[PDB]
C-alpha cells in the first residue's frame, strides 16, 4: 500500500535497436541513441585477413612520400580521411492546418573515443627505444594528433585548404578539392578558396588533409575538436561516461534532421606507429562513440504548402517550347494593372510604380 | 493507389501428345465479379512528407 | 566612420626544406562573425566653429 514511493525517474518504453523507434513516440518522448563510428583512415576494412591487408585495419597504410618539391604523390591510404554516417529516423506529424510540423531535434550528445588503452601495448615491431642493440620498447604511438567532429541535422558543409596546391591527390577513390571542383586547385585554396567547399556527401573519402569544417555563416551541425602539431608530441585522452555535451543551440534549439537524419560525423588521429623495420611512419585512430539525445520539436513550416502542392501541379503541364515572354527578349512590350477608379487624371501616358514600398504618380517624364 | 488486383492459375492437367509422351497440360480462363464499395479510412499520410521530400 | 575592422595574425610556425634550412614559416586564415547593432549617440558639431577646431 504505502510502501514509502520512491523517486521519479523518466520511463523508459523500450529499449533495442532503430525500429524501436519505429514505435509511436507521443511527443515529450525523447529517444537515446548511441553509436559510433570506427576510425577510417588509409587501409579500409575489407581485406579481413591480417596477412591480405596485414590488418593495418585502422591504420594509415603506409607514408608514401614525394619524389621532391615538384612531385607530391601521396597515396590512397597514407591518407587519412573524414569519419561519418547518418542515422534514419522515422517521421512525425504535422498540422498543415497551423502550417506546422515537428521535426527529429537533436540536443546533447556524450562522446568518447576508445581504445587510448590499446597505446599500451610496448612490444611488437616498432622501432625500439635503444636502436643500437635494438632494445627497449617497440615505441609507442606518438607524433600530431586530431579530433575533431560533429553532429548535425544534415551533413557537414566544409572547406579545404591544403598545404600545397600542387599534390597530386588521385582523381580517383578520393574526393579532392578538384574531385569536387574540375580545375585543378590554385594558390587560393591553399589559403581559403572560397570556392573549394563540399560538402560530406561521401564518407571515408575527404581526407582530412584537404578538408575542414567549414564555418559557413550558416550551419544545423555542432562541430568541433583540435589540431596538436608535431613530431614527438605524446597522445593524451579522455575516459568519461560522466559527460554530456550541448548540441544545443543559442536560441534554445539544437540540430533538427532536416530529413530525417541525424549525421554524425568525427576524426581521430593519436599519431604515427613506426616500424622498427624503417621510417615508415604509419598514423593510428581510434574509434568514436556518440550518445544523442533528441527529442520531438514543432516549428513553423518553412516554405508554404500551396507553393509545393501547386509548384509540383504545375511542372506537370507539357513543356513549352516556344517564343520568349520573358528573358532578354521579351516580346511583350508591356504592362499595366489597376484596380482602383482615380478620376481621369492629366497626362495619359503618366506612368505609375511602386517601389519598395511605396506606390508613386511617376515623376513627370521630364526630370 | 486505385488498384485493384486479381490474381489466379488454372491448371487442368496433361494433355498427351497421340505420339510420344509430351504431356504439355491446358489451363482455363477465370472471371472475376468484384463487388466494392467507397469506405473512408484514416489518412494514413503525412502530406508534407513531401516536404520532407523536399529536404 | 561606418567602418568595422578586422585585423589579425596566424603564424603557425616554420615548414623546413628538405634540402638546406630554409624555413619558410605557414600562416593560416581566418573566420569572422561580427554581431552588430546600432546604438544611439549624440551630435557632435554642436561643438562650435572656433570652440572646438584647431582647439
Ligand atoms: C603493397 C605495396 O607494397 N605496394 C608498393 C608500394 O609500397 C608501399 O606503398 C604503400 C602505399 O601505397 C604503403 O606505404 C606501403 O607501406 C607498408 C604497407 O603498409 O604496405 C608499411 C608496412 O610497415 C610494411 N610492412 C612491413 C611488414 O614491412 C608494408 C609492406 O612492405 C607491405 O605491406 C608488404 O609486406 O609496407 C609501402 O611499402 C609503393 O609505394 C607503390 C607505389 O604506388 C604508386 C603510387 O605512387 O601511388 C601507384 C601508381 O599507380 C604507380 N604508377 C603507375 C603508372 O602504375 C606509382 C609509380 O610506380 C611511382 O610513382 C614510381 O615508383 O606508384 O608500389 C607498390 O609496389
New interface residues.
Partial sequence: KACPRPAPVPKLLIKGGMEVLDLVTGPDSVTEIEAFLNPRMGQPPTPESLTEGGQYYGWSRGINLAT?DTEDSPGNNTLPTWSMAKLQLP????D?TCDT?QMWEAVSVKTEVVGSGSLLDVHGFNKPTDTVNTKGISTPVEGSQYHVFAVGGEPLDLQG?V?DARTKYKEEGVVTIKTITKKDMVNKDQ??NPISKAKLDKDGMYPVEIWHPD?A?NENTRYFGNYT?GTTTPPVLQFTNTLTTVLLDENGVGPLC???GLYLSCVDIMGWRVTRNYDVHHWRGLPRYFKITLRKRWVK???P?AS?ISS?FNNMLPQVQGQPMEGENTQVEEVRVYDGTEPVPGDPDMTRYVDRFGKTKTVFPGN
Avoid at 517521421?91 to 504535422?94: A, D, R, S, V, Y
Wanted: aromatic content about 4%; overall charge neutral.
Fill in positions: 621532391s517521421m512525425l506529424n504535422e498543415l510540423l585548404l598545404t589559403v581559403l564555418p555563416k602539431g532536416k530529413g530525417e513550416n518553412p516554405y504548402m509545393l509540383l
